[PDB]
Ligand binder design. Structure first.
Ligand SMILES: [Zn+2]
Ligand SMILES: [Zn+2]
Ligand SMILES: [Zn+2]
Ligand SMILES: [Zn+2]
Lengths: 363, 363
């Protein structure tokens, strides 16, 4: 087309950090074409208290009055079932996010995905409250010499039995395999949802980032800016991710995992911080893929309908009724995104032409 | 043991660069325990002329009077059969190194490995002069949308048909698949050498680096200091390289691919230079592998006997008869190696303890 009404757009995997970085990035949610954002909890320290999660959103809302913020707790032994019920009651959180220990940013204070039993009381409460369980689905890497090797290329596949058990022990709970990167994970999600037909049946879904629809291992091998977790994988994996994203199936929907880092935390000779920054042009990135796939008819489901449906986003929570309007005027992605002070971020696909822009119209 | 006499040690894959970097690194050849070095030609601009290869060697000999230097040309369209004959007849080179275009440091002037026949007059002259054809055996990446894609993980496997065709078309030409990184390559070299046992029968050999005996993809994913070409691959590949290095087979011998870069060329958000710096502790790094594999009796073959046999190094070429003595004194690898002025290099396994040290015995 040349103008597409995406309605209330949906980015269900957002990192905005804190401090000067957050002031720079949260207004970019709306700027990249996103009305509703699900905010991830891996701050330093993690978000595990009620007052933190409440004030964090107030800080966010002040920065972005027209952005709807859905919040989350960082899965943790700190949490209690009481904190869960007390938070779902006051509608302070809409889900809880699990980070396996060591596999990504600010995950050191994370959990071990081999003994999930210690958190079954937490999922117990979460299920009763219809809260979402978000999973960074990678097993930690394993050296040893006895048990089968786990590395960055198969850590997501090795996590897939854990996902299935969690689904089989909490069958009413809403679970999301965040940012899928492998054909194996796509196939697992499609099998778990084999008998779904419309749509509110889905209880296990997967988010797909913008960058994993573009990247393979070649793009990050000598390019830390394209390094994130889970890493982009083989060409066959990308094909499956793209096919899923444009499939029109209600169990795949957009989650950017926009993960902002100052440029000096990417230009390291060791300990490069994982993460791609896509917030500034979130929807235009996804538009490009759907255009090239001749499937622009499925864009609205992927970037709006399916996440709204799965998260059950009701009209009474949306901060602004403005519609996101995609229109086919080319823009150039800048080389850097700066706050004029101490923050420079390199955006995903810095310097590239995008065919689409996005603006806001009232309902 | 305590103390092992390795004799005249060989590193048949050495980068020493130019200028201040070369003044820092070439004395480290001896320091890391290596008597004989095969000097790669991927300078800027590459070594493709007789005068430059002779002048380079003089520089190197002045920096390191006890080190034996074997030189090479960079395979390029500027080379002619007359020049091959002239360089051979002047004892100015021992081989010619092929870089497929785009796959590694200073390879933009390299070749198209789907059009090797354009270089058959060169190989013919090399065969007649008993020179060595060294191959950086990786196919350039093709992501394509046509036939099966090439990426950094399979680029070496994708190159193996070209190696077999070269050996089949020039059966008397000595060919080295440099720095093997994949089990598939190991199997291909073993199969080409099916009916060899000792040693002058070997026509196609492979070098193995120090770092590929330690590294997997998990070690460089977020660590540019460990990023090299060909990239370190899966646990199963590393296992097969280690087993090859301690094999005692005459068609595997040591080539460090020590590839020094200043620290600022590693700490980049894009365009990280490929290369691991291992020269300063080359022999001790290998000793650690052979000790852990209960294979110390095979060490002298892998790091001395087999390279000398394959390159036919004669006692009249040797710059010093000093013998390398490995002795089991602990040492720690520094965090950084500097010339005191503008160059800092991060060495392989910076900060780790090694069990062995190497010294020189005059003979
Ligand atoms: Zn994640
Ligand atoms: Zn994330
Ligand atoms: Zn190479
Ligand atoms: Zn090399």
């Amino acid at each position: 087309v040349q103008e597409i009404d995406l309605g209330l757009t949906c980015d269900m995997h957002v990192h905005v950090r804190e401090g000067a970085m957050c002031e720079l990035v949260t207004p970019k949610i709306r700027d990249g074409g996103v009305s509703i954002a699900y905010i991830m909890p891996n701050l330093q320290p993690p978000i595990t208290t009620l007052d933190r999660v409440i004030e964090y959103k107030k800080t966010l809302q002040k920065l972005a009055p027209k952005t709807t913020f859905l919040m989350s707790f960082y899965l943790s032994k700190d949490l209690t079932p009481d904190l869960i019920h007390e938070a779902a009651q006051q509608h302070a959180i809409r889900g809880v996010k699990c980070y396996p220990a060591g596999v990504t940013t600010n995950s050191a204070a994370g959990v071990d995905p081999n003994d999930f039993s210690a958190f079954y009381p937490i999922f117990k409460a979460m299920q009763e409250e219809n809260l979402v369980l978000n999973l960074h689905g990678e097993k930690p890497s394993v050296h040893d010499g006895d048990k089968e090797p786990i590395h960055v290329l198969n850590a997501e596949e090795a996590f897939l039995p854990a996902l299935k058990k969690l689904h089989n022990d909490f069958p009413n709970l809403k679970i999301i395999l965040e940012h899928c990167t492998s054909e194996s994970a796509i196939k697992t999600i499609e099998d778990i949802n084999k008998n779904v037909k419309k749509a509110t049946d889905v209880k296990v879904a997967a988010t797909l980032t913008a960058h994993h629809l573009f990247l393979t291992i070649d793009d990050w091998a000598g390019n830390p800016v394209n390094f994130c977790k889970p890493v982009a994988k083989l060409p066959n994996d990308k094909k499956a991710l793209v096919k899923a994203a444009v499939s029109g199936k209600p169990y795949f929907f957009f989650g950017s995992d926009s993960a902002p880092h100052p440029v000096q935390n990417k230009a390291n000779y060791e300990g490069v911080c994982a993460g791609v920054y896509s917030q500034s042009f979130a929807i235009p990135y996804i538009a490009q893929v759907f255009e090239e796939q001749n499937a622009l008819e499925n864009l609205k489901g992927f970037v709006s309908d399916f996440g709204i449906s799965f998260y059950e986003v009701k009209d009474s929570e949306v901060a602004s009724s403005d519609k996101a309007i995609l229109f086919k005027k080319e823009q150039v992605i800048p080389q850097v995104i700066s706050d004029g002070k101490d923050i420079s971020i390199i955006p995903f696909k810095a310097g590239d032409k995008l065919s689409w822009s996005v603006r806001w119209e009232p309902r």
